[PDB]
UniProtKB/Swiss-Prot annotation, chain A:
Complex formation: Component of the ClpX-ClpP complex. Forms a hexameric ring that, in the presence of ATP, binds to fourteen ClpP subunits assembled into a disk-like structure with a central cavity, resembling the structure of eukaryotic proteasomes. Interacts with Mu phage DDE-recombinase A; this interaction remodels the viral transpososome for replication.
Portion of the parent chain present: 148 to 258 of 424
Stated family: Belongs to the ClpX chaperone family.
Role, per record: ATP-dependent specificity component of the Clp protease. Uses cycles of ATP binding and hydrolysis to unfold proteins and translocate them to the ClpP protease. It directs the protease to specific substrates both with and without the help of adapter proteins such as SspB. Participates in the final steps of RseA-sigma-E degradation, liberating sigma-E to induce the extracytoplasmic-stress response. It may bind to the lambda O substrate protein and present it to the ClpP protease in a form that can be recognized and readily hydrolyzed by ClpP.
Phenotype upon gene inactivation: Delayed and decreased induction of the extracytoplasmic-stress response.
Inducing stimuli: By heat shock. Part of the clpP-clpX operon, clpX can be expressed individually from its own promoter.
Protein name: ATP-dependent Clp protease ATP-binding subunit ClpX
Swiss-Prot record, chain F:
Protein name as it appears in the record: ATP-dependent Clp protease proteolytic subunit
CDD domains the UniProt entry points to: S14_ClpP_2
Source species, domain of life: Bacteria
Stated role: Cleaves peptides in various proteins in a process that requires ATP hydrolysis. Has a chymotrypsin-like activity. Plays a major role in the degradation of misfolded proteins. May play the role of a master protease which is attracted to different substrates by different specificity factors such as ClpA or ClpX. Participates in the final steps of RseA-sigma-E degradation, liberating sigma-E to induce the extracytoplasmic-stress response. Degrades antitoxin MazE.
SUPFAM superfamilies according to UniProt: ClpP/crotonase (SSF52096)
Source organism per UniProt: Escherichia coli (strain K12)
Catalytic activity, as annotated: Hydrolysis of proteins to small peptides in the presence of ATP and magnesium. alpha-casein is the usual test substrate. In the absence of ATP, only oligopeptides shorter than five residues are hydrolyzed (such as succinyl-Leu-Tyr-|-NHMec, and Leu-Tyr-Leu-|-Tyr-Trp, in which cleavage of the -Tyr-|-Leu- and -Tyr-|-Trp bonds also occurs)
Entry coiled-coil feature ranges: none
Length: 111, 192, 192, 192, 192, 191, 192, 192
């Protein structure tokens, strides 16, 4: 995952995977559960002036904020980039539980 | 030379010399013959540490055999001017100038190790030239002697007359004797 | 060994030497015998600080036993030229040049510590050679003596003849005595 | 020249000096003549390691021909003050001051290599001046002799009378002789 | 020790020494006895600035007591060869070579501080050996004296005969007197 | 000025001085007159390498015209104390103290170049003072002589009596002579 | 201290010393007494630049009072060996060795400044010992004299006899005189 | 000082030293008086290059006046031990020890500049003490003399008798004469 407007990826793609199991049925997909691995890599780099404009890290967190708390998120129909394409799947994440799991290497020293 | 040590902290680990690492903890090392260059450096550390936390105390370790008088007053005045109390500790020895700075610490925050030694004596100087110039310099050093005795009496709490008699000739005082005299408040034998 | 300190800036943290950290705060240290090399370094610092903020005042700490007359004049001329007001401070002692540069500071911003000393004397020089060349070099040092006494009289506020009588032989002025003479304006005893 | 070494860490490789790398393992090297500057460096290392782990012991390798007594006392007082046990090791030799710091180590953690040569002697000093001053200095050095002998008896365990007789003149003690004398606890023949 | 200053740029903050930071602004510092080593450094600095911007004017602060003639000629020829106008400034003093380089600056851009002291004298030299060799070396210093006086007349504007008479012996010129002579164009008393 | 060498590995590229690069290969350079400071540096290298790996062998290049006896004993005792076998290679020459450290290496791991010169002599010392103090120091240096001869005899394998007669005066030796004498095991002529 | 300059390239900003920056532009500085160590440094720079671009021409700024002959031959042989043409520029002065290297430059690319001073003399040496050894060293230096003169005649174009006559005693040549003698080709008066 | 150079590689820009850069190309500089300290540095360079590529040749540049035999002999044995061939080039001069290392180079790869001077002499040393010790040291140096002459004959190809007579006294050999004697193989007049 990467910040929007970049060649890496978009956070909205997470819902696409959840739709595959849900048969692309938004009604039942809203009551699903999600798992996000390797969240530790998204942590901000040390003493960043922010001029670098971190896309892999802080940018991902800013986009997930509204997603976790619950908001309508446009989802492409299948394997497509976000674009002016009229067809978009509006999936609400308010009821879609999220479990973020990661190995925070070095956190022991902090504690 | 000095060994580099690493500070273990989040946001990255910083490598500092052992002296600079202790400086972060408000610890200044006053050692060797007192002079303008070393004294000026200590003044910057005192002023610098004041900016971080004027309330926190500053520790000064004294293992000097004495030195110039002018350089010593630059440190003594700086100690009084800065709001944070300066805790002085005597390590190894504290001669005339080192003792004057040791006793100049804040009341109740002056320490000395059990096997440390202290000595106090009057100022020593000399001038070569015409008799007229000699009178000027002789009067100047005498004023310094009287001025130094006045300040020593204030911190130690001894009478000015007593200080004059004791400082006429070199007087060696052990750590316990210094406590009775008033140069220091207590001794640090073991950690509690 | 000069210690290194850390500064918590917006763009992360930076490590600076103790003197460079104070330079960032418009503080210059004048220590040791005055000479061409160190004088050209202080001049560079004054010019650099002028570019950053001409309105802000520059602080100069004078703890020196004096030195070359020419090197000191470069600093004096630089101070008067630059728009910012240079606030001189005397730590430990201030000899002929240290005192001349001390009194040269902006009116009302000249300070001295209570236990500091000041010393003013006429120039010292010498030449070996023919009588013809001796007369030449003798004329300049006499002219320099008159020139230095005129400038000192301006800052101190005393008459030219009075400065000549005092500068004839070495004179020692305490911190309060300097205030009456006019070399300094006030004394910095404690932080308020 | 000191050769730098690389340590592998979670963040990545870090370049360290040879002495600094060993300092991380609680190893301090006391080498050469004892003096004020080197003593403060050892004191800084002892204090720094105390903060990291006050429970883990420290290993002090001693190889020196002796030096100033005042400087050595700072190290001795520092060792007794801090909580960590200081394990002294004698490499090559240990003179009067080197031996005093060697035997000062924690009981049961004092070691000496088999071919090391230990030596103990009474303090030596001198003063030139008036008869009155000589009396003062003579009294102070005799007190140091009594104080040092009293401490040696405590660590070694021998009577004060026996220490005075042996320390009147130079006495060379091999590693096995030192074990029975009480200076060291055991010999480090091999790692196992 | 030279202090380090931070420069804020679009790319980011950069650390520069006090002398390098001023070099970026086309400021070259001439200090101390002139010699081949420092001269080559100044030459490199001049050529470097010419490449960056051959239109902007360079500045050369001159505070030196003089030195080798040959080293000075390298600087003089370099200043005249390059296109940028070299603005010489006199701080503290300017001896024979310092004055020759000072007056060698671009017409209308030569300055001196009010209290600076300029001095001009004929070359100094000596040789020991056979009479034949003495004649050879003696003729060179005469040519150098005539060649140096010729150039001084060109810059100052004074007649060649007057330069010879005035330069026969050491002549000290104050800042205002130098303006009349032609060595400098204006005085920098205060910033307007 | 020592040159800098770049080590290239998959992780990245690192710059090291010539002496530090060889230190990674368990190679210590003993050079010049022996003293407390240089000996302390060598000791630090032995302990550091012992910590990295206590099984790999350590190499020691000896080229020195002897030095302080006390400083030498620190190196010798350290080599025997640590588990790793310390190999000794004589480059150029090995005087009294250098030779003692050379022969002190692990059995079968003592080498010398073909043109190296090995010299052994008894300890040198002096004392000025009262006759009583002289007797004390004279006995101390004599004990050191007997102790050093005993240690040399053990490593070389020569009898103590033979070592005493030979070490009474300077005895220059060559690489082949050292092999038969017992100071070294073999000569490194070519690779 | 050597000033540092910033070079801006597509890769990013880079920091170089004033000498290294000029080395990037194929400029080598020959300054001071010639000796083994400085000569090897110049040799390394010539070889390094050869690899970078063997077609471009290298520049050599010669300002030196001469030195060892053996060290100079290493530089001369290196210049003729490598394909790039070496342009020699005389700044300040060029003695026997400096002049030999100056004239050894590429035909047509040898330059000199107007106020430069060139001096050429025969080799000088000395030996103390037996008469037999003296005859050997005496013959060796004579070979160097003839060998050096033979090479000077080739570059300058003067006859070997003419070179021998002039080099018998120290001969000083100005920049215009050198052009006639053949040591240099043209003078760099002003930038065109 | 040493000028830094930049090496352009796919990994990125790398700032190398002038000597370190050449060391990367299997080039070792032997300069100055041969001593134990510099010899160990050259030995380390050889061993390091052997590991990187034992097949590629090594180029040793010799410009020195000679020195200690023991230190120089450690380099000779190292060259013969390692598998890669060690090419030797003589720049400026190669004295007794420098010549032994020069001729010790790989057959067919030894080179010499046209103007280089190669001097060879017998070993010289001295001893002070009793007659018994003199006999020991006198026999030792004579064995070294025969040892050095035996090896020198092997590389040059001349008989032992001829080398003994020629090396009885200082003998200077030019680059062409060295080819006939066998010390070197070819002369690098110009790049082809």
């Amino acid at each position: 995952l990467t910040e929007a407007g970049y060649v890496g990826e978009d956070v909205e793609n997470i819902i696409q995977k959840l739709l595959q199991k849900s048969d692309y049925d938004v009604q039942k997909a809203q009551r699903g559960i999600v798992y996000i691995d390797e969240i530790d890599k998204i942590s901000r780099k040390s003493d960043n002036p922010s001029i670098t404009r971190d896309v892999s890290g802080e940018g991902v967190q800013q986009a997930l904020l509204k997603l976790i708390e619950g908001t309508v998120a446009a989802v492409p129909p299948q394997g497509g980039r976000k674009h002016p394409q009229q067809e978009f799947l509006q999936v609400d994440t308010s009821k879609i539980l999220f479990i973020c799991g990661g190995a925070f290497a070095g956190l022991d020293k902090v504690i | 030379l000095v060994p580099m040590v690493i500070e273990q902290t989040s946001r990255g680990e910083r490598s500092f010399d052992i002296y600079s690492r202790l400086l972060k903890e408000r610890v200044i090392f006053l050692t060797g013959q007192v002079e303008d260059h070393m004294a000026n450096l200590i003044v910057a550390q005192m002023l610098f540490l004041e900016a971080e936390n004027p309330e926190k105390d500053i520790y000064l370790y004294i293992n000097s055999p004495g030195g110039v008088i002018t350089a010593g007053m630059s440190i003594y005045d700086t100690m009084q001017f800065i709001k944070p109390d300066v805790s002085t500790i005597c390590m190894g020895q504290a001669a005339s100038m080192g003792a004057f700075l040791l006793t100049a610490g804040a009341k109740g925050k002056r320490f000395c190790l059990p096997n440390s030694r202290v000595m106090i004596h009057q100022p020593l100087g000399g001038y070569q030239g015409q008799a007229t110039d000699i009178e000027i310099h002789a009067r100047e050093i005498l004023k310094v002697k009287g001025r130094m005795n006045e300040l020593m009496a204030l911190h130690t709490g001894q009478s000015l007359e007593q200080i004059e008699r004791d400082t006429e000739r070199d007087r060696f005082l052990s750590a316990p004797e210094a406590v009775e005299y008033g140069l220091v408040d207590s001794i640090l034998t073991h950690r509690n």
